[PDB]
Amino acid sequence: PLHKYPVWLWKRLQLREGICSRLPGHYLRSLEEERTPTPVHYRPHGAKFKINPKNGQRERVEDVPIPIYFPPESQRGLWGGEGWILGQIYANNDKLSKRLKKVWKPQLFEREFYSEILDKKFTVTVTMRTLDLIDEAYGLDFYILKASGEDLCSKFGMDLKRGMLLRLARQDPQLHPEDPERRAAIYDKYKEFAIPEEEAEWVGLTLEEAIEKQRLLEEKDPVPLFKIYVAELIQQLQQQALS
């Protein structure tokens, strides 16, 4: 026999089934977006057509990504668009020798930051590209809120983004009373986003966490049928009496 749907559509089928179909639209769209990240370990081509030497004929060129590995240390900390590259390297840079395997490792600098939106210092083993992006984005909060989910490549970054979005949406007192001018200035500095509350709670959550949250929201202990029975009875008696 044969299958009705291909093997690469079962995830979409399970999402369109029942328990995974009650998810909100924005979360499903953000999960099914799937956008390519920024080139990090390779220089992308300028134009779509490149004139190669030796022959005067134009050819279309494309920039392919590099299959990099993400260890759990990357998800725990805040890394850039790099990671572990499990590739192969020849001997003396020639294909007429031996094909050896070489795995590069990024550099880790255990530094300390200070988030202005959360007002709490965290110890994160930051690298160099992340520090460069933070310096170019003029702060850490801007680097966290501007970069999308395909740029952080870490769970802590998405958690920080979701926390900042909730803090900016709920208008909850960040610091403390007796000086609201600082909180007002902080809220005015980060005003070019302002994601609503019903959509900021589903930013960065995985599939299992989303299913757990949807089950907890749709829990509801079974109401006893006695209340429904007496309600139907009083409705029927009112309908037969008022007529």
């Binding site: 990090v40 370990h41 390779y42 220089r43 279309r60 494309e62 392919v64 590099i66 299959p67 850039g80 668009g81 790099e82 590259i85 590739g87 192969q88 390297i89 020849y90 840079n93 294909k95 094909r99 590069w104 990024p106 530094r111 300390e112 200070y114 160099m128 590209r129 520090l131 310096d135 003029y138 702060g139």
Partner: protein
């Protein structure tokens, strides 16, 4: 970040399709790394009076190490963003009157 290029060249598996890769494409080659490069100095605007590295008023392009260590965490310098420069120059113009 180590920038490497792919060997054997990608055979271009269409424009809207997924690029099919082979086991021979795993071989890379190092061309240039982010390190071993003469670093550049960033521009930071200070807010207080220090020694001979800065002064309250104008800006000075200092090193990245000093800026990340004893300038930004201690609140002695701000990034060179196009937002705070406006208020900085406004305060500088209001300070130096006619």
């Amino acid at each position: 970040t180590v920038i490497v290029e792919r060997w054997w060249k990608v055979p271009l598996a269409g424009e809207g399709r997924k690029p099919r890769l082979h086991r021979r494409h795993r071989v890379y080659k190092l061309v240039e790394d982010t390190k071993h490069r003469p670093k550049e100095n960033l521009e930071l605007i200070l807010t207080q009076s220090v020694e001979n590295v800065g002064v309250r008023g104008d800006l000075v392009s200092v090193k990245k190490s000093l800026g990340r260590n004893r300038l930004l965490p201690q609140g002695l310098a701000v990034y060179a963003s196009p937002e705070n420069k406006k208020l900085f120059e406004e305060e500088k113009l209001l300070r130096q009157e006619g």
